[PDB]
Amino acid sequence: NWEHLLSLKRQGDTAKRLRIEQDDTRLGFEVDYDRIIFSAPFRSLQDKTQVITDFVHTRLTHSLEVSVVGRSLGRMVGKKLLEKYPHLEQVYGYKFNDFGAIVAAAALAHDIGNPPFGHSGEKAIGEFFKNGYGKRYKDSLTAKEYQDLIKFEGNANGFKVLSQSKPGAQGGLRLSYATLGAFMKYPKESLPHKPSDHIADKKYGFFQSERALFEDVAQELGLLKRSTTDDVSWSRHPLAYLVEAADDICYTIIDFEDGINLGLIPEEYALEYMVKLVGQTIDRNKYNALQETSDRVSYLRALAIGTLINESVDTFMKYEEEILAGTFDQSLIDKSNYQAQITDIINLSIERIYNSREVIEKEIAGYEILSTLLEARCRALDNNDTHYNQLIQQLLAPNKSLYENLIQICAEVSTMTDGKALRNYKKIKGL
């Protein structure tokens, strides 16, 4: 039922929030976007680079552009959903911009919990608790608590960042449950690990510390159960497919755009890899008149993203009922008519960007930086009386169960800006 999937509930609410009773100048879904923009975690993305460190390729700009693509996807699907289910507007008061706001807010916050250095950063945190100093806690943790650590997931840390309760601030940003549902691409716990090849089982979406929260979210949204055991799992909020397509589209096309502007990808490849995606719409005489490389590739990027947005909207509507029933097993982009071209683009980015020497060097350095901060925090946790460990406390974590302390340390190390992680690492090593 879409009416339940479009929940305006916020954590702690004691009474229902009806869509028809909202002030449209203060609509819960749009407030969610504003709350993210002004949050300290989102602002910190100003000082967080992607794999390439050019000072003009931040995670902030990526997140902005993903939210813009998400708003467009949500608006377009929202208009068509209100055509399919007219009672949603005539009776319940939903409007097509409501769907754009939900997708836009969830897409804006997708990278908010990810550690520095990309997938290497997640992998370094996991290795610390699997084989590093952190393995000593294995026997003091449940299997699912330990799995949170050895397979630490930036998606699940984002959910924690958005919802974490603190003195004077219960519920974090207190986003609408529809937004938290659209945010949750992997609505399962850390265990069991990859039970199938379904896209929603590739990773997990919440830590044990947020299990009770997502239980409240899933029951309020009426998400369909995928497990009937104590290992909980649900079918994805339909709008999470649009959040994922926005991310897939931007990662594919914009990484390519960046690789060309940065010199990693020869410009001579631009047309060849994009011709299928832009062929019918490109004004070739306009393309040839553009004099700057950055202008030519941004034109191709806009055309390719527009093509993929329109197709993703149509794919969503073709499979809407399978998605609403939890039987859609793939991503929207997996069904694309351009899958072969998308794959060639992604593979070229892996070869020329993600496996470039500068990116490899940065990830190797990231492993040391994160491993050091985790060991410093964890030894300070185990012996908090020594003078050294008191200083580490004042520096890295000023102002609980063992698991709650360990997951908090991972969450705090993960959300450090690049500048503060390297600086603090430098001091703990004297540079």
Task: Cite the annotated binding site by residue number.
Answer: 26, 34-35, 50-51, 59, 62, 72, 110-111, 155, 185-186, 203, 247, 255, 301, 354, 363
Taking alpha carbons only, the member of 191, 192, 186, 195 closest to residue 154 is: 186
Question: Which CB, 62 or 188, lies closer to Mg ion?
Answer: 62
| Residues with Cβ within 8 Å of residue 322, at least 6 apart in sequence | 328
CB of 72 to a second copy, least distance (A): 7
Query: Annotated binding site for dATP: which residue ranges?
Result: 26, 34-35, 50, 72, 185-186, 255, 301, 354
Segment near Mg ion (CB under 5 A), from 160-168, 212-220, 243-251, 401-409?
243-251
Residues binding a second copy (CB under 8 A): 24-25, 33-34, 37-38, 40, 43-44, 46-47, 55-58, 60-61, 64-65, 68, 72, 75-76, 79, 96-97, 166-169, 286-292, 294-295, 298-299, 302, 399, 417, 419
Residue 106's identity, in one-letter code, is A
Contact between 292 and 267 under an 8 Å Cβ cutoff? The reply is no
Question: Which CB, 304 or 374, lies closer to Mg ion?
Answer: 304
Give the Cα separation of 367 and 120 in Å (integer): 7
Contact between 56 and 262 under an 8 Å Cβ cutoff? The reply is no
Give the Cα separation of 249 and 280 in Å (integer): 19
Segment near Mg ion (CB under 5 A), from 20-28, 109-117, 170-178, 310-318?
109-117
CB of 143 to Mg ion, least distance (A): 30
Is residue 30 involved in binding Mg ion (CB under 5 A)? no
Give the Cα separation of 162 and 371 in Å (integer): 25
User: Which of a second copy, Mg ion, none does residue 166 bind (CB under 5 to 8 Å by kind)?
Assistant: a second copy
Taking CB under 5 A as the criterion, the residue among 127, 247, 248, 311 binding Mg ion is 247
Q: Assign 233 to helix, strand or coil.
A: strand
Q: Assign 166 to helix, strand or coil.
A: strand
- Vertex 196 angle, CA 195 and 202, to 5°: 85
Give the Cα separation of 177 and 182 in Å (integer): 9
User: Which of a second copy, Mg ion, none does residue 247 bind (CB under 5 to 8 Å by kind)?
Assistant: Mg ion
Query: Residues interacting with Mg ion, by CB under 5 A?
Result: 111, 247
